[PDB]
Structures are given as C-alpha cells and as structure tokens.
Amino acid sequence: ANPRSDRFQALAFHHVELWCADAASAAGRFAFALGAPLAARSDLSTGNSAHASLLLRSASVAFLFTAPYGADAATTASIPSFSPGAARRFAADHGLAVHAVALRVADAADAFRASVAAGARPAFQPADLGGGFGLAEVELYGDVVLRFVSHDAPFLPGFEGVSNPGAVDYGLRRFDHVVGNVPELAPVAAYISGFTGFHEFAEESGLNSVVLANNAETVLLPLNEPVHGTKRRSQIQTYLDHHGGPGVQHIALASDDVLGTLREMRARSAMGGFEFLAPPPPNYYDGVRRRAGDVLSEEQINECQELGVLVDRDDQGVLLQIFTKPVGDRPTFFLEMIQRIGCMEKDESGQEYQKGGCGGFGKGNFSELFKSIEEYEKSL
Amino acid sequence: NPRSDRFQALAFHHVELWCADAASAAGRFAFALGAPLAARSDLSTGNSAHASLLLRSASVAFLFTAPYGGDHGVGAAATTASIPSFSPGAARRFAADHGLAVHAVALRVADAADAFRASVAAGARPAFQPADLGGGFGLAEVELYGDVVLRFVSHPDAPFLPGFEGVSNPGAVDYGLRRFDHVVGNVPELAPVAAYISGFTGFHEFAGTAESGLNSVVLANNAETVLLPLNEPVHGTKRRSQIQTYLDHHGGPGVQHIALASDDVLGTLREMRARSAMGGFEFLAPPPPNYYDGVRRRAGDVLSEEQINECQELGVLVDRDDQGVLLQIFTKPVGDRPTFFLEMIQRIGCMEKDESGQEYQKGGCGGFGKGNFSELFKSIEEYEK
Ligand SMILES: Cc1ccccc1-n1c(=O)c2c(C)c(C(=O)C3=C(O)CCCC3=O)ccc2n(C)c1=O
Ligand SMILES: Cc1ccccc1-n1c(=O)c2c(C)c(C(=O)C3=C(O)CCCC3=O)ccc2n(C)c1=O
Ligand SMILES: [Co+2]
Ligand SMILES: [Co+2]
Secondary structure: OOOOOOOOOOEEEEEEEEEEEHHHHHHHHHHHHHOOEEEEOHHHOOOOEEEEEEEEEEOEEEEEEEEEEOOOOOOOOOOOOOOOHHHHHHHHHHOOOEEEEEEEEEOOHHHHHHHHHOOOEEEEEEEEOOOOOOOOOOOOOOOOOOOEEOOOOOOOOOOOOOOOOOOOOOOOOEEEEEEEEEOHOOOOOOOHHHHOEEEOOOOOOOOEEEEEEEEOOOEEEEEEEEEEOOOOOOHHHHHHHHHOEEEEEEEEEEOOOOOHHHHHHHHHOOOOOOOEEOOHHHHHHHHHHHHHHOOOOOHHHHHHHOOOOOOEEEOEEEEEEEEOOOOOOOOEEEEEEEEEEEEEEEEEEEEEEEEEOOOOOOHHHHHHHHHHHHHHHHHO | OOOOOOOOEEEEEEEEOOOOOOHHHHHHHHHHHOOOOEEEHHHHOOOOOEEEEEEEEEEEEEEEEHHHOOOOOOOOOOOOOOOOOOOHHHHHHHHHOOOOOOEEEEEEEOOHHHHHHHHOOOOOOEEEEEEEEEEEEEEEEEEEOOOEEEEEOOOOOOOOOOOOOEEEOOOOOOEEEEEEEEEEEEEHHHHHHHHHHHHHHHOOEEOOOOOOOEEEEEEEEEOOOOOEEEEEEOOOOOOOOOHHHHHHHOOOOOOEEEEEEEOOOOOOOOOHHOOOOOOOOEOOOOOOOHHHHHHHHHHHOOOOOHHHHHHOOOOOOEEEEOEEEEEEEEEEOOOOOOOEEEEEEEEOOOOOOOOOOOOOOOOOOOOOOHHHHHHHHHHHHHOOO
16 A cells, blocks of 8 residues: 655656766676667767766666766766766775666656755755756765656757667666665665655565655665674675665666576676676575466476576565676675566556566565575585 | 897786776676686685786786775785785776776786896886795886886796686687787877886887877887887877877876787677677777778788778778788777777788797787878878768
8 A cells, every 4th residue: 555655756767877987898898798788978979078978778777877087168068967076986985886876757846846845965956958858866875866857859968879780689678676775774764765755665684674666666766774793794784894885785677588688698697797696506496386386387487497597476476586796896786687477457547557566576585595505505 | 139128028918907897897808809707806716905807818818906995004914915016095096097097017027026126227116026926926016107017927837816716607708819919108208218118128129101190119028029119199280199189088198009919800800890789899980992992902912802801891900011911900999088999900921930940920020000090091081082
C-alpha cells in the first residue's frame, strides 16, 4: 500500500553521471563492457572548453562520464552544475564513482523548490538550459547528488549526437535501482523520504537495508548501512572505508534476456571487460530448481548455471540477477545485471505494466548462497 | 654509431601511465590494443598503496597505476607498495594536471644501481635512488622531460615485477603488437633537454622538411633498440602547431605518442578498427584517395598491390627511407584532451646477419613518417579542388 506521497512528478531515471579523471577511458571501457554505444558528447569537438562529457546509452539506461580539462570564458560547459575543483576533488577521493543520479521531472524549478522547503539542502539551484530544458540538483546523500532535469530532443543542450555502425547493443533496457551506502541509515532515509515524499518498499551477511521508491515504484533508491561487531566486517563498511565516505554502492541494469546479454558481456571480460563475481557452487542451483523450478524450466535455469546468474523469489515473481566485480580500482562501485519475471497487469488504462520491485532485490541470496558455499565446502 | 652509452640500454621494459582509474584505462587499452591483462598488483595482491595492472602484448608492456584514497604519513619502512618509487601525492597531482598521460618510460638495463650512478654522474636529476625490489630485480628512476621519468629496471633473468600476480585470462586474444618502437616527448625547448638527455644517457642523434610541422631530433642507444625522439614547436608559424597545443593542454612537457611495432600492421589494424565503435581507439580520418595513388608512385616497387590497397581501407600512412618502408597509422587522442595519442607502425627490411648471424633489424628502418606531413598537405589541397 504505497501512499503515492511523492512531492514531485518523478517519472523515471534520466541519466547517471559518473566523474573520473579521463571520461574517454571510463566511457570507452563501459562501452564494450556493457554493450551501450557512444550516444552523445560535449567535448572540445563541440565547443566545450570546460569539461569533456560522453554518454553511453542502451535504450533508456544512459551513463554519463564527465571529466574536466578551464578559465572564465569557459562558460562553454554543457552541464552548469559542474565544477573543475569539485570534479578533481571527487576523482581523488573515490576513484571512478557515481556523482549524480538524475531523474526526470515535470519542471526543474518546482521539484527543487518542492524539496528546498521539505528539508533538502540545495546543491545547484534551478537553471534554464534554454529551449525547454531545465536543470536542478540537491544533495541526496554524501557527495553524490540527486539531479532534476525536464524536457527528436537531444540529451542536453550542448550535446551533439554520436553515430556509429557497430551498434554494440547487449540487450540492456533500463536502470532499475541505484543503491547507496551510508554510515547511519535512519537520518539519511528520513532526509531523502522527507524531501522527495518517496515511500519505503515492502517486496546476517552484514547489511541493514531500506528501499525508497516513487508512486509508480519505477525510481528505486535503496539505502544501506553496516552492522558492526561481526567477525568478518560488512562489505558496506569496507566500502565506506575505501570510498572515503558515503556514496553509490552499485547500480542495477534491467534487461529482457539477461542470459543472452551475459553471454555477450562475459565474452568481453577477457579483453578488459567486466570480470564477474565467482559463480555460486553447483549445489546452489540444486536449490533454485526446488525454489524457482515452477517458474523457470531447466533450460532457462541451465543458462543461469554457467553464467553464474543468481535467482531469488518474492511471491509475485522471480528475480534473475548477477553482480560484477568492483568496476573501478578500489572495492567500491560495481554493477548489477538483472531481469524481472512476474507481476504484470493491464490496470493502467489497459496499457500493461510491471509493478516495480517485482522479485525483490535478491536479499534471500545472502542465506541460500552462504549455505550452499558451506554445503560445498564440506563436500571437498 | 658512437656507441657511447653509459649503461646497457638493453630494451624497453614497460611504459607506466599514471591515472586516477587504472582499471578503466587498462580495461579500455586491453580491448582497443588487444593486450590482455598479464599481471596485477593491488588490494587483491596485498598492495594497499596503489592499484597497478600490467597490460602485455608480446614485449609491449603498458603499466597502469592509480593511487588509493589512503594517506599514510612519512613515519609509516614497512610499506606494501609494489613499485617503491610510487608516491600518492605525486600520482594525484599527475592526474589533476595531465589527465591520462604516461609517467615513466622504463628501460631494461644491465644493472639499476649502475645505470643510476652513470646517469647522475653525467648531470641527471635523480628521481628515486636505486633499490632492490627483491630477487634479482632492481629499480632506479631519473627524469627526462618534465614529470615523465626514465625508470631503470634490472632483472638479469620470475614475474614482470616482484609483488605482481600474473593474470592468465582464458580466451584472451592478441592483435599482433610486438614491440615498443619509439616513445616521443614534446618538450618546451628542444636544445636544452636533448643536451640534458644525451648527456646522462650517452645516446646519439638519429636520422623532407615540411611546413605544417615542428622541430625534432631522435636519440637512440647502441643497437638502436630504444628510440627517444623529442619535439619542439615552431612559433610565429601561422596555424596552431600540433606540438604547442599539446604543451598548453598537457600543462608542460610530456610524452606525445608511443610507436608500437607489429609483424602485420594491416591484420592488427583490421582488428583494432573493429573495436573503435565499442569504445575502442578512434583513428584519424583516412587520407584522401589522391594520397594512396601517390604512394604507388613512391612505394610501388616495395609493396604488393594488395598491400597498398589495404593501407587505403584501413587508412595507413606509407613513407620511404632509403633502406626500408614504414607503414604507420595514428589514433585520435586516447584521453579526453587532445594530448597523448598512439602510433601503430610496421617496418620493412633493413636486416643483416651481422656478427653472430642473427637476422636483426636496423633501428629506424623507414624513419618516422616525416614525409607524410608534406604528402598529406598536398593530398588535402588536391582533394579540396
Ligand atoms: C556480500 C557480497 C560480497 C561481495 C560481492 C557481492 C556480495 N553480494 C552483494 O553485494 C549483494 C547485493 C548488493 C545485493 C543487492 O543488490 C541489494 C540491494 O540491491 C539493496 C538491498 C540490499 C542489497 O543487498 C543482493 C545480494 C548480494 N549478494 C548476495 C552478495 O553476495
Ligand atoms: C601533426 C599531426 C596533427 C594531427 C594529426 C596527425 C598529425 N601527424 C602526426 O602527428 C605525425 C607524427 C606524430 C609522426 C611521428 O610519429 C614522429 C615521430 O614519432 C618522431 C619525430 C616527430 C614525428 O613526426 C609522424 C607523422 C605524423 N604525421 C604525418 C601527422 O600528420
Ligand atoms: Co540490487
Ligand atoms: Co612516430
């Protein structure tokens, strides 16, 4: 029973801005690793002297990589919410980490001011990019910012489109959820739920969890916090140790055939692509046949077996998922490849949709994987 | 050749690029250059000081190194760094100033302590006093042009470097890169640094005047294995020099490009250009067709019909020395700044069974493509008709 209490029309994820020291290398690696070609650029090739921005896109998922180069007349920046000192500061503290999570908004001025009184500390007050585009940014958590942008039409003013025949598309379709790790969960969760109006979500390894979501449950913002005192310390705390503060832990990418796409992503893992986490032991998939065998026939399960895809269930669907290694240098930011199978409905006027968060987020895999690891460790 | 080297400049060992994200730069280079990950030294190896990845393609060894966010004091003998010359502050100031640019050019020497001593005794500025990394490995570092370092490495032999866990990725393919041909620097002013370098390294000089170019001089060791060309801009020369705009965007002197030798530059380029769409290395716009009809009248006696034809599809430049032909192609700048770029070449000929009887290959066989500054100039004007 979501309240639909969102204080601004948050439609969907617009773009995710990463900040590095060389936006060509990171975007270059993410291009073949994810299978999303270069779609837009704001560099010296476009008259931009302040920063080099490049955008990979695979349908609706749009990664943005922004690095700096300038002076006073460097008003040529496409993004006005950009600072060279902050960009170099960010690249030294966290390596390749997410700086902005941009959402689509009815109007840039409203959602900012709807949050400026709801408790959001401002980061970039609204600005008119010209011709229907407006940009706004609030602080969210840590140094990553929540960005508001409103509207064929280009990505942003100052971005020229990129054409390529390679058309390297690995079937990736949409951003699903953007998870962030913070020291204490309660204050930042009340802060984000307070200034957005977003609600919680209904559907130990060492993580205390909470998931924010909009009315349509399409803009998912899960939050994380560690649990101290464990013999082996939580992966959230070691993140906060190596990230140097709170940040975006991972980002989920939704596909409609994540098996065939993983076959393409793993093909590039040997040549500089995304090396994936070690596949679960064989007896883990003996479980998924008992758990999800009614939804997944063997051939669909066996495609998950070699590729190492994980399987977790809620009542209204099953969630295929697989995690990458830390894509950057430090054990910090990584990527989650998922596909959700279940919970359809033609309730929205007859236009069908899938209720967001279908299948959960794989929280049950902490239990079934650790047990299958111990069950396999005994058999050797 | 004078044979006046103060130390045994055996060969290129590696080129170290200092960046703020080694995993991304090494990952993109491995895909674009076809050099699989052959070694790594980071947190997974016990190295809490820096993350380092070694990209390897035969002898081509690119080393990408990025610091971690930690800040250990000067009091903290018991360090965990694989490369002891690495400092966290100089790596961040290097990434903030120059972006993605190489920081060290490593020459394999007979002995590191002796290479350092012979260098500093001839006026070399010390960068890192000699050490013994363990086993038989020895390290030494002296400056050449700016923040770039002429690192000395000494294994008389074992991995790439001690503390580096070798990586063997099954299915890892290779395009055909074999050798570092030359590492070129772009220096404020040529005469001082060329006299400075040649002084402490004992290198000698090495040898079509063009209008849209620069000034240059190439240094080389005894066997001409390692080539250290140096560039200087021309001022008051109308169009913006492609060397000064480097110094303006790079923030001082640095390494302009690196030539990578190949047995089959054609087959290697055909695989590299297949990656340019998916985040690979974008190459310069191909020369107009008048160029490749002109290379037939200049190098038709030395290249087959099919060989000249395939240089045209892949956009490879052709130049001729009296001794051999040089097929070369250049990438668009690999970083965000039009700074560091890469050069893919193959040299043809210039081999003799000197001394023992091995085939050998004369260094600089074909030159460095000096005749293409002029040849490409006319081809644009002829095409702009
Ligand atoms: C624990 C661990 C160590 C080394 C590498 C990987 C892991 N690791 C995960 O990171 C992991 C994650 C990150 C999720 C996950 O996506 C998730 C959400 O999206 C938000 C709610 C909290 C949460 O955990 C689910 C299962 C996971 N599992 C099962 C796992 O093993
Ligand atoms: C200058 C320039 C601007 C925009 C795109 C392309 C170019 N460009 C080059 O960069 C270029 C280079 C860099 C070399 C080259 O490698 C070389 C050496 O390695 C050592 C001595 C200096 C030198 O010329 C040769 C020919 C070149 N040619 C023909 C060319 O057009
Ligand atoms: Co998730
Ligand atoms: Co060259």
